[PDB]
Amino acid sequence: SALTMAEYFRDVEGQDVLLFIDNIFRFTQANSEVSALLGRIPAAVGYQPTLAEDLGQLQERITSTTKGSITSVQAVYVPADDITDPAPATTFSHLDATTVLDRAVAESGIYPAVNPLECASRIMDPDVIS
């Protein structure tokens, strides 16, 4: 629903819009809850088999086209601090800038608890930045 509102502002109004989402994981979690009652065999860990396709359709809609631009900031919950989990991992390929927070950093009094060795950015290239 919110993405549809942003798309209208992007296309019809031709404006540069911001889109904040918190939390995008719950979209996957909710579909997993209903997946069992829809007669679908659970996949690994216990998510729905359609985890990758459903998230991809939503993510591809969140993009900047020739008409307008959408700057999207999405918060991803890494269950039990396990970044190997299917949901957090599936969301890494659909992003231009990943900010990975670590509990150990926060416990040391460092805020924001960013682990720079695990973060990445697409524009970290000399051609784009100075």
């Binding site: 039990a80 601090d81 396990d82 190997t84």
Partner: protein, 50 residues
């Protein structure tokens, strides 16, 4: 899975520990190999000191 990787991280630490400790052995062995010479040249300076 995190639980499995918890052991893997734990075993990862022990591996580096072995390497560093082995490096310590290399250092001491060199010092002992060069300090082994005194064994030849001792037991004669302290004669009238007795």
């Amino acid at each position: 899975s995190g639980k499995l990787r918890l052991y893997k991280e734990k075993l990862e630490g022990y591996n580096r520990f072995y390497s560093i400790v082995k490096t310590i052995k290399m250092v001491t062995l060199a010092k002992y190999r060069a300090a082994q010479g005194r064994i030849r040249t001792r037991d004669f300076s302290l004669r009238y000191t007795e």
